[PDB]
Design a binder for this molecule. Structure first.
Ligand SMILES: [Mg+2]
Ligand SMILES: [Mg+2]
Ligand SMILES: [Mg+2]
Ligand SMILES: [Mg+2]
Ligand SMILES: [Mg+2]
Ligand SMILES: [Mg+2]
Ligand SMILES: [Mg+2]
Ligand SMILES: [Mg+2]
Ligand SMILES: [Mg+2]
Ligand SMILES: [Mg+2]
Ligand SMILES: [Mg+2]
Ligand SMILES: [Mg+2]
Ligand SMILES: [Mg+2]
Ligand SMILES: [Mg+2]
Ligand SMILES: [Mg+2]
Ligand SMILES: [Mg+2]
Ligand SMILES: [Mg+2]
Ligand SMILES: [Mg+2]
Ligand SMILES: [Mg+2]
Ligand SMILES: [Mg+2]
Ligand SMILES: [Mg+2]
Ligand SMILES: [Mg+2]
Ligand SMILES: [Mg+2]
Ligand SMILES: [Mg+2]
Ligand SMILES: [Mg+2]
Ligand SMILES: [Mg+2]
Ligand SMILES: [Mg+2]
Ligand SMILES: [Mg+2]
Ligand SMILES: [Mg+2]
Ligand SMILES: [Mg+2]
Ligand SMILES: [Mg+2]
Ligand SMILES: [Mg+2]
Ligand SMILES: [Mg+2]
Ligand SMILES: [Mg+2]
Ligand SMILES: [Mg+2]
Ligand SMILES: [Mg+2]
Ligand SMILES: [Mg+2]
Ligand SMILES: [Mg+2]
Ligand SMILES: [Mg+2]
Ligand SMILES: [Mg+2]
Ligand SMILES: [Mg+2]
Ligand SMILES: [Mg+2]
Ligand SMILES: [Mg+2]
Ligand SMILES: [Mg+2]
Ligand SMILES: [Zn+2]
Lengths: 50, 86, 135, 134, 122, 105, 52
RNA sequence: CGCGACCUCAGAUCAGACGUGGCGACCCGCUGAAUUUAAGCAUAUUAGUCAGCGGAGGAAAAGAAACUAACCAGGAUUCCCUCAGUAACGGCGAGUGAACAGGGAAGAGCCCAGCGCCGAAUCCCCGCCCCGCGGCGGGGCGCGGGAAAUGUGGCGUACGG
RNA sequence: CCAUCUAAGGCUAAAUACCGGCACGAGACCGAUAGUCAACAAGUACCGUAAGGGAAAGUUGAAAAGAACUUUGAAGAGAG
RNA sequence: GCCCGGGUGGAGCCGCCGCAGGUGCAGAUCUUGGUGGUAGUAGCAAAUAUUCAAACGAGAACUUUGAAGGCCGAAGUGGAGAAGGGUUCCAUGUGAACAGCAGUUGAACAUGGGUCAGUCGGUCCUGAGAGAUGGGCGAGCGCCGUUCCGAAGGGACGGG
RNA sequence: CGACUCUUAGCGGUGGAUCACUCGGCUCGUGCGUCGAUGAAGAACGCAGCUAGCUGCGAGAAUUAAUGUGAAUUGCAGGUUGAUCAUCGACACUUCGAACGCACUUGCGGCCCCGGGUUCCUCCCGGGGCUACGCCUGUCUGAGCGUCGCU
């Protein structure tokens, strides 16, 4: 919706910022077990609640 | 009609985000949170669901002040003094 | 008295629990009054209370409260016990003279139900298994 | 046999403490023995390793009589790197091979003021212990 | 090159604020340089300027509150910041004087009949 | 259902007895703690008797035990007065005193 | 359940009997050797040394 | 009518304090079922238990007899062993069910109102001076203010005074 | 007739309780379908409007020494 | 049930006398996980329709351009909004996975960008209604009630 | 013979059993036994040169000061008068939240004091400090054909 509240817009902004993939220098640290970002969300699949 | 066809009509929401507990349980028409009962002074907590009690109990969050007092206690709440300088 | 807060009658269950409007509260009206005064004045401590008048539909009690943070009592050795944190809400925990009467506290053959702290304590002590290490 | 009730002998607890010790405990843990000459001179048996002490490698594929200067101490990996022990990888670049300090002996120390303070303290404590043992 | 808190203590507030302003403008220049593309040497300095700003602010606040409580020590009523900060329960206990004083009846009793040290033969 | 022959039993396990069960796995630790407290108090009161104040001779109040003699709660005021001991000084010099007990004999 | 019967009690006379039997059997070379102890050089198996 | 006391009751962003909410294993006060057992079931039982409400502490509650007993008498409370699956209750069916004495752990006793006697001999707060003040106290000076005789303090409480 | 207390006001530590919290010690216990639901970015992902429901998932190697270089293919992918 | 031989494997294991148990599976429309025949089978058939040439490219029935023939036919398969979605918008790049054929293409993936207000709305008013205080009730969290058992105005021309 | 099918073995797939490991649980015990209007528990949003999650932290934002220690952190860069770690007593601690000017859109105020406009003469802009309910002691201002006293 074009009409939206400030807190809704802020929550959307945080969720959008969280959706990037991991930096390529992570996976080759020493004590690392992370292969990829498993929390990525697609707008078609999962609908953010709300 | 009562199923798939009816599922298309839902386009206005019943709940929104609570200002106290943060969950999406603030009933707008009743103006009341269904998880913490926000307008009430006391938080909503029934002990017929230990899982719900343990989901948002004291040990779950930042503990940004209780964590500090836990270690202040180990010195008798020492205050107003500093270690000897070099 | 106290009638059962149930929708119309409908105290669903066996007939022994069908009573509605002949039941009696376990605490006295004096204790109820003390607890109401204590709840309204949360910064004071309830000491005692007494009866001053009654009619068909009301009972009137005057209750003594003490401000625990006033110097006039905090500097007096023999009344500073009430300023201790242990004595918060005596009327709510049934520790005043009027509240104690309903707990069945006493000494002798008339008060075996409350050997120990209270009814809760006596029931606990009587209703556990002492499974010793050796048996 | 351990009799102190406040120190544990549990394997899992000891391993957890060892693998999550902070850096200033890592410094203590990665200590290596002195050579015979240094031991006789300073009356001290072991010393935590520093950045540019030199070493004889005693155990492993690289054991030998070569004095090697340590280049840097990787405390996260519980390892030190010696300027001579190394191997070449596929592309030809040479990388250092990790050696644990416990399999390492110092030839001579880097005498900093803190180092000599530590040495004198260790020697004094050992000597007073021996005198009490007399 | 390195700003330390040891030598900032003797200085007074004016030049401390001036140095804080210089650090702030340097930090702003560092940020704009980072956005427009700068050397890794300039990128790394951002943390050191931030920490220097933190040190200056900490010294300012420490001296200010030290002076404030030194000035207020001689007064009956203090600000809540300067009042002792322990647990809420311990803040409202009886103090040492009103915890120690005794009624003179008990004073009389313990004066007349004190505890005695004694032993009995086997 | 009853078997061939045996005793009729009335086990009192028709409540939620498994929630209120008192295991005694802390019995040795309790004994150790009581001991330590006992010796701590004994050291605290340096020359005084460890057991405490002396107590009096009493007869057990029952046909089953009236032939036996116990240790009582404390000496009574008649005995203290006829022995020339002040009721307030007896407690501080080590004599247990109670005012409830009478003296019929 | 934690309230299993972990501990057992034995009669004091039986405990003393077991102790006496063990002490008596410790004095026989055949039984001590069959226990696996190497005592072929021991001068006398009820081995007693002074209080020094 | 006016002026002045007292009583009762208001108003304050008046000066200085105090409560709220959380956790809730253990504790205290209420409210409080039905599954189940009875080979059915309504009294019983589950059970004064679950759920619900309120209030604390490091422990809580209880506590120094308007007691137990009937003995040649014991002597606050609390906890363990035993009394005892006993006395007793119960469609006397299913089932339920203590206490005294005895041995131990621990052990500690006290204070008001009243009755009376002391020139209210009592208490709180504001100002100045001196001490240390990070648990706001001690001493002095104030023809400083107030509380209080519709009763503050000392003596004194069933063991007598 | 006897016996025993003195109600309708108040304070009081110790012995006692403790599946929450802080910090510890141990075990004839379980050993990744077990043991807490959770050994791992677990009350996480995800589902439901909501009350609420709720996983799967440990192991290269001593050391990355993690396969330079040549060759076919667009590449995945192969041969040396 | 077990003992040897051979192979793989890379760090612990067993015999005897006792002790203890969460101690032996073919089934429970058993629980979890894995894999078959069916089977390269059913099927990829609602709304008339595509064709020629060129370019790019390893690769073209599906991409792009041009040409032709068609459909929607203004109550549209057009142009804009509300609710809802929340970056899906735009440019560049990729073709591992997805788009139930394919793709040089995409609402896919990867890098970056993009929403500018005194006048457009919110913000203000009150509607149906919701909801404090006073009061009442309530063991109690609280509930009823909205002018009703209230000392309910902190405002003002002017004058001193 | 050839195909197909069946059986057994070798090898290779598919799958992830078994075994061996265990910074995790479960159970028992011990000492302590501490939250909050000086703003708790909880939630939201932000903070790293390269940072999504987890963790840590709060516009001083993967941390400041102080003390102890004594040469690192590390995935890549950059740069002993004390690097890094630990301890933690100084300081600081955004928005909601009992949540406190009124409401919950972050909308609308009021009062006092400062800095800009002014050169206070008022607006306007920015900054700072207050503005919740109940209740206790005292102070001030009051009300009453309530009980009185003098005129
Ligand atoms: Mg959808
Ligand atoms: Mg609650
Ligand atoms: Mg009841
Ligand atoms: Mg009565
Ligand atoms: Mg030692
Ligand atoms: Mg049979
Ligand atoms: Mg039989
Ligand atoms: Mg049946
Ligand atoms: Mg039936
Ligand atoms: Mg019934
Ligand atoms: Mg019942
Ligand atoms: Mg309950
Ligand atoms: Mg509370
Ligand atoms: Mg507490
Ligand atoms: Mg108590
Ligand atoms: Mg008495
Ligand atoms: Mg008794
Ligand atoms: Mg028997
Ligand atoms: Mg019958
Ligand atoms: Mg019963
Ligand atoms: Mg008894
Ligand atoms: Mg004893
Ligand atoms: Mg008097
Ligand atoms: Mg009395
Ligand atoms: Mg009494
Ligand atoms: Mg009491
Ligand atoms: Mg042990
Ligand atoms: Mg396995
Ligand atoms: Mg594996
Ligand atoms: Mg291995
Ligand atoms: Mg087992
Ligand atoms: Mg099977
Ligand atoms: Mg086909
Ligand atoms: Mg359209
Ligand atoms: Mg369009
Ligand atoms: Mg697009
Ligand atoms: Mg496809
Ligand atoms: Mg314009
Ligand atoms: Mg209402
Ligand atoms: Mg085969
Ligand atoms: Mg971030
Ligand atoms: Mg520092
Ligand atoms: Mg340092
Ligand atoms: Mg609005
Ligand atoms: Zn909520």
């Amino acid at each position: 919706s074009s009409h939206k509240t400030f807190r809704i817009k802020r929550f959307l902004a945080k969720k959008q910022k969280q959706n990037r993939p991991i930096p390529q220098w992570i996976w080759m640290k020493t004590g690392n077990k992370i292969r990829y970002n498993s929390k990525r969300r697609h707008w078609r699949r999962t609908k953010l609640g709300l | 009609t009562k199923g798939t066809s009816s599922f298309g009509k839902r386009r206005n929401k019943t709940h929104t985000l609570c200002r106290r507990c943060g969950s999406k349980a603030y009933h707008l028409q009743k103006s009341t949170c269904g998880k913490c009962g926000y307008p009430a002074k006391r938080k909503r907590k029934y002990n017929w669901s230990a899982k719900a009690k343990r989901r948002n109990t004291t040990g779950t969050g930042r503990m940004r002040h209780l964590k500090i007092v836990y270690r202040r206690f180990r010195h008798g709440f020492r205050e107003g003094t500093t270690p000897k300088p070099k | 008295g106290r009638k059962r807060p149930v929708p119309k009658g409908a105290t669903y269950g066996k007939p022994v629990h069908h009573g509605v409007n002949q039941l009696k509260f376990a605490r006295s009206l004096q204790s109820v009054a003390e607890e109401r005064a204590g709840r309204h004045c949360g910064a004071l401590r309830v000491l005692n209370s007494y009866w001053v008048g009654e009619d068909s539909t009301y009972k009137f009690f005057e209750v003594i409260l003490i401000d625990p943070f006033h110097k006039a009592i905090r500097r007096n050795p023999d009344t500073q016990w009430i300023t201790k944190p242990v004595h918060k809400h005596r009327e709510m925990r049934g520790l005043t003279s009027a509240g104690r009467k309903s707990r069945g506290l006493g000494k002798g053959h008339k008060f075996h139900h409350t050997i120990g702290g209270s009814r809760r304590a006596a029931w606990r002590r009587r209703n556990t298994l002492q499974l010793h290490r050796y048996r | 046999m351990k009799f102190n009730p406040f120190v544990t002998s549990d394997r899992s607890k000891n391993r957890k403490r060892h693998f999550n010790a902070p850096s200033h405990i890592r410094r203590k843990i990665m200590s290596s023995p002195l050579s015979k000459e240094l031991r006789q001179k300073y009356n001290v048996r072991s010393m935590p390793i520093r950045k540019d002490d030199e070493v004889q490698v005693v155990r492993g594929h690289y054991k030998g009589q070569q004095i090697g200067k340590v280049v840097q101490v990787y405390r996260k990996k519980y390892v030190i790197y010696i300027e001579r022990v190394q191997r070449e990888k596929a592309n030809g670049t040479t990388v250092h091979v990790g050696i644990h300090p416990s399999k390492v002996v110092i030839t001579r120390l880097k005498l900093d003021k803190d180092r000599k303070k530590i040495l004198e303290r260790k020697a004094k404590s050992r000597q007073v212990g021996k005198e009490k043992g007399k | 090159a390195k700003i330390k808190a040891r030598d900032l203590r003797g200085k007074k507030k004016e030049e401390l604020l001036k140095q804080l302003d210089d650090l702030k403008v340097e930090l702003s220049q560092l940020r704009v340089a980072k956005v427009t593309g700068g050397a890794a040497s300039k990128l790394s300095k951002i943390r050191v300027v931030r920490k220097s700003i933190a040190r200056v602010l900490t010294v300012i606040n420490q001296t200010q509150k030290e002076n404030l409580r030194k000035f207020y020590k001689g007064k009956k009523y203090k600000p809540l910041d300067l009042r002792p900060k322990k647990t809420r329960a311990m803040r409202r206990r009886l103090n040492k004087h009103e915890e120690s004083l005794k009624t003179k009846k008990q004073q009389r009793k313990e004066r007349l009949y004190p505890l005695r040290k004694y032993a009995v033969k086997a | 259902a009853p078997s061939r022959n045996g005793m009729i039993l009335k086990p009192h396990f028709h409540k939620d007895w498994q929630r209120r069960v008192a295991t005694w796995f802390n019995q040795p630790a309790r004994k150790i703690r009581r001991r330590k407290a006992r010796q701590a108090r004994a050291r605290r009161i340096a020359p005084r008797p460890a057991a405490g104040p002396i107590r009096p001779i009493v007869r057990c109040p029952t046909v089953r035990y009236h032939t036996k003699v116990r240790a009582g709660r404390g000496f009574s005021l008649e005995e203290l007065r006829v022995a020339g001991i002040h009721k307030k000084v007896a407690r501080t010099i080590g004599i247990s005193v109670d005012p409830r007990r009478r003296n019929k004999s | 359940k934690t309230w299993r019967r972990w501990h057992r009690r034995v009669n004091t006379t039986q405990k003393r009997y077991a102790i006496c039997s063990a002490l008596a059997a410790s004095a026989l070379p055949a039984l001590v050797m069959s226990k696996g102890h190497r005592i072929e050089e021991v001068p006398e198996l009820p081995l007693v040394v002074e209080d020094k």
